[PDB]
Structure 1
Amino acid sequence: WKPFETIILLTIFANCVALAVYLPMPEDDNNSLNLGLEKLEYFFLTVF
């Protein structure tokens, strides 16, 4: 019943940026920023 809905749609907007800044690379390559955002997925997955 709290303002626990603007906390949630503001971390839903945070998972929309962790998808946009991801750079897709061919044949199984990565960078450091791509591997950082595979850690943020666990955070967003334990908040939702």
Structure 2
Amino acid sequence: WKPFETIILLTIFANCVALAVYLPMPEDDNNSLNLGLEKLEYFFLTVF
């Protein structure tokens, strides 16, 4: 079916934003957003 262009293109483009606001912190520190998107990295792994 055609709609795999429609879905999974937005799957990547959401996932790169998931790596955009990933804010690195030097000596093992997490703010809140890095805590959340680690669990959201499970969502992107779930799809593929």
Instruction: Please confirm whether the aligned pair reaches a TM-score higher than 0.5, indicating the same fold.
Output: yes
Identity of aligned pairs, percent?
Answer: 100
User: CA shift at 1:38, angstroms?
Assistant: 0.3
Aligned pair count?
48
DSSP 3-state at the match of 1:27: coil
User: CA shift at 1:4, angstroms?
Assistant: 1.8
* Unaligned runs of at least 5 residues, structure 1: none
| Structure 1 consecutive aligned stretches of length 4 or more whose deviation exceeds 6 Å | none
User: CA shift at 1:11, angstroms?
Assistant: 1.1
Deviations 1:7-44 (A, max 9, x none): 00101100000000011110111111110000110010
* Unaligned runs of at least 5 residues, structure 2: none
Counterpart in the other structure of 1:26: 26
DSSP 3-state at the match of 1:23: coil
Higher normalized helix content (fraction of residues):
2
DSSP 3-state at the match of 2:41: helix
TM-score by length of 2: 0.90
